[PDB]
Nucleic acid binder design. Structure first.
Length: 798
RNA sequence: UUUUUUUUUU
């Protein structure tokens, strides 16, 4: 049971400062008595660090059974692993972190810190989480997509483990007080788990009072002249406000060190905030990064916009947009908490006391605001067929769940309309750590040696804000030259000719290749307008994407430039990934459509993005990565599609009239199926598409054509020897002068009975009984031949 | 056709 730690005297006093220590036996008694415990403790409560220690003291860690702790951030995983390992007297062999592309875990590991996504991937490998006896899910109040999928899954895992008489304990740790979606949720936890509230210790003063930027300049002005020396933090909506206020404040200046903070800021400039100020007071203009991501020790006065920037996905169109709205009360309070963490602090809210009540208490969960295809593909891999049966803490919209299954079926991830389970292709995609669209690109890309190219493109698309912003006399020319420098570079990476057809996606590839060519130089990144932090993240992601692919397909990471054929094959892999994102140029009217494109998903005209390399080229068909609305509805991530590609690449999105007699249907040896040329038209828009070789539609005519090719020996080459001796032509399966011939019906009926319209279908039928078509096939040969046929009847080897 | 990303987990 009990396990020692050997506390050092100096860390003892610190540890005793935190409040949760008093309630240790209370939390440990709850954990023993209940299967699931919810621990609610504000920042500084020390719950995250100490609760794994308590359970370690109670002996939950063991050989097969360890304590796990899941976190939203990578940083919080590693940092927490280190702090606990030092707060206890234990090696990082015992207390470890696992994050995306780094590791710390050993058989010695008894407390494991991890990101929520890492736990999900373990749930894929073993759904029972046998290697865990306790799982702690921390920062549940953040309600990230992975916390939600984890909480719903673990309720089932806890149940499955319990009936196996191997109890798994789940502890849910929340900084905020409200857990209604957990306690009141009948589907998630049939019995409301006990809720433990831990108080913690530096009070925050809140002051209530068109453009939030102006008042903030005033507030920062008024505070600074008036109040004692202490850190100033201002929350602003976006980067340009941050820069507008910093330059404005620098112009304004007794002491003041002005530092702008935003997530994409260069890590060097970022770091300036934490270090204390050089007769100069600290005032930092920041986005939400200061609210959670960064903790600034010297801050004593915060000024609050009252406004957040968020990204909204339109379900009908699929389109994304960036809008500014009122903060949540919890976001408003948490921003205030930043003010007074190591001294009494001041929060001045630029909204009225009345406005604060108008705020939505809790921000909407991140799952409801975005496509959920990645999760459902994960859920389908765990055999969760009925998505609505899943116990979402907050369920996503119906249209969101229906859209996802439509996309995942369209990629081939989910089979077949009564149900759609994961496919073999869908199962291997589930392993890849990227969105299922790019996941299919990866699975599709295992050919022509462009796999590292596609891995690089996908990695460059998955990363956010690849290119440095560089926006908003002699100083303007320095900045303006940089833009022309980066634009010229973007064009240089994307060649002219077939290379330019890959467009923006080629520009990402050429950016990744050029960066790796210079050994990912920070000098190179600043020279060519690439972002250094993003480029490193690109490199790490390519590594993890390359290792994952090797698991699926047994077979030099930093690459060499592609040949023209490779670039066009890259175009086809990308178009197949982005099938739902196809636009056609308009030619015929309204002045709004002069250079526009039309996409079936939305009525409005869409345009190539002005910074895109395909902007002036304006090809007739493109696939876009995403559509973002600002002033117009713009296509970003654009690549060219050759119109004839569409039916062979995106057959699910097309509608074919009838199979064509000219050219006549053929048999495909690789597929094992009947092919035919079919004319097609895109589903909602009505775009005419040429006739191309496509699989023959399922139907009674398909069986006839397959039966013809089988008798000719094309389907199975063992039967090909007999083709000379057949009594009537194989052609009589389609049409015959001998109407009363029974030969053709008997073969066709037997084929229908076993749904044998393909090599794989018939080969399957021969497993269930290997003499399946023997009688019927013999009907087509003279009797003397029958015995030799039966002797080698399976016309398949193996 | 003319560029206006908040924040983060595999």
């Amino acid at each position: 049971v009990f396990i020692p730690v050997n506390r050092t005297p100096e860390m003892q006093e610190e540890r005793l400062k935190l409040p949760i220590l008093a309630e240790e036996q209370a939390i440990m008694e709850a954990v023993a008595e209940h299967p699931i415990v919810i621990v609610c403790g504000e920042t500084g409560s020390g719950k995250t660090t100490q609760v794994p220690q308590f359970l370690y003291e109670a002996g939950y860690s063991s050989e097969d059974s360890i304590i796990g702790v899941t976190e939203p951030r990578r940083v919080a995983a590693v940092a927490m692993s280190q702090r606990v390992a030092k707060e206890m007297n234990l090696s990082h062999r015992v207390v470890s972190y696992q994050i995306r592309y780094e590791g710390n875990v050993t058989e010695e590991t008894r407390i494991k810190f991890m990101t929520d996504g890492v736990l999900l991937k373990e749930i894929q490998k073993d759904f029972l989480l046998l290697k865990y006896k306790v799982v702690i899910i921390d920062e549940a109040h953040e309600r990230s997509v992975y916390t939600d999928i984890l909480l719903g899954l673990l309720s089932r895992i806890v149940a499955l483990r319990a009936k196996r008489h191997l109890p798994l304990k789940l502890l849910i740790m929340s900084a905020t007080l409200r857990v209604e979606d957990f306690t009141q949720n009948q589907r998630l936890f049939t019995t409301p788990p006990p809720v433990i509230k831990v108080e913690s210790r530096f009070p925050v003063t809140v002051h209530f009072n068109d453009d939030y930027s102006g008042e903030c300049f005033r507030k920062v002005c008024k505070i600074h002249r008036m109040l004692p020396a202490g850190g100033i933090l201002v929350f602003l909506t976006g980067q340009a406000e941050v820069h507008a206020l910093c330059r404005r404040l620098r112009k304004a200046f007794l002491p003041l060190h002005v530092l702008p903070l935003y997530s994409l800021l260069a890590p060097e400039k970022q770091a300036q905030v934490f270090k204390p100020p050089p007769g100069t007071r600290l005032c930092v203009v920041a986005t939400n990064v200061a609210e959670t991501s960064l903790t600034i020790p010297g801050i004593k006065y915060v000024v609050d916009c009252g406004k957040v920037k968020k990204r909204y996905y339109d379900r009908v169109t699929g389109v994304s947009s960036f809008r500014v709205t009122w903060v949540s009360q919890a976001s408003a309070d948490q921003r205030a908490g930043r003010a007074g963490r190591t001294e009494p602090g001041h929060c001045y809210r630029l909204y009225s006391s009345a406005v604060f009540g108008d705020f939505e208490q809790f921000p909407p969960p991140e799952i409801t605001r975005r496509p959920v295809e990645d999760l459902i593909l994960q859920m389908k891999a765990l055999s969760i067929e009925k998505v609505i049966n899943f116990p979402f803490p907050t369920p996503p919209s119906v249209e969101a769940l229906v859209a996802a299954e439509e996309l995942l079926v369209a990629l081939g991830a989910l089979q077949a309309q009564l149900s759609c389970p994961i496919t073999a292709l869908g199962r291997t995609m589930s392993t890849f750590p990227v969105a299922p669209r790019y996941a299919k690109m990866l699975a599709l890309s295992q050919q022509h040696g462009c796999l590292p190219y596609t891995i690089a493109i996908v990695a460059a698309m998955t990363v956010r804000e690849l290119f440095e912003e560089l926006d908003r006399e002699k100083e303007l020319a320095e900045l303006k030259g940089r833009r022309a420098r980066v634009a010229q570079m973007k064009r240089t990476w994307a060649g002219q000719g077939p290379s330019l057809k890959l467009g923006d996606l080629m520009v990402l590839l050429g950016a990744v290749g050029a960066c790796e060519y210079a050994g990912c130089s920070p000098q190179f990144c600043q020279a060519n307008g690439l972002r250094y932090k993003a480029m490193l993240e690109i490199r790490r992601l390519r590594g993890q994407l390359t290792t994952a692919v090797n698991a699926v397909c047994p077979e030099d990471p930093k690459m060499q430039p592609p040949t023209e054929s490779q670039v066009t094959y890259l175009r086809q892999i990308m178009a197949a990934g982005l099938g739902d994102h196809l636009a056609r140029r308009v030619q015929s009217l309204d002045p709004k459509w002069k250079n526009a494109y039309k996409t079936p998903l939305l009525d409005d005209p869409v345009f190539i993005h002005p910074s895109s390399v395909l902007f002036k080229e304006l090809p007739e068909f493109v696939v876009y990565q995403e559509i973002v609305e600002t002033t117009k509805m713009y296509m970003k991530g654009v690549s060219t599609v050759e119109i004839q590609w569409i039916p062979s690449l995106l057959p699910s999105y097309c509608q074919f009239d009838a199979p064509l007699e000219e050219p006549a249907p053929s048999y495909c040896p690789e597929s094992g199926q009947v092919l035919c040329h079919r004319a097609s038209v895109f589903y909602r828009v009505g775009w005419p598409l040429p006739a191309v070789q496509v699989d023959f539609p399922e139907g009674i005519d398909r069986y006839k054509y397959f039966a013809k090719f089988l008798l000719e020996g094309q389907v199975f080459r063992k039967l090909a020897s007999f083709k000379s001796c057949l009594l009537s032509s194989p052609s009589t399966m389609l049409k015959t002068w001998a109407r009363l011939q029974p030969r053709t019906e008997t073969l066709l009926r037997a084929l229908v009975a076993h749904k044998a319209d393909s090599r794989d279908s018939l080969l399957a039928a021969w497993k269930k009984n290997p003499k399946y078509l023997l009688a019927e096939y013999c009907e087509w040969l003279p009797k003397a031949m029958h015995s030799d046929v039966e002797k080698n009847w399976p016309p398949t080897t193996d």
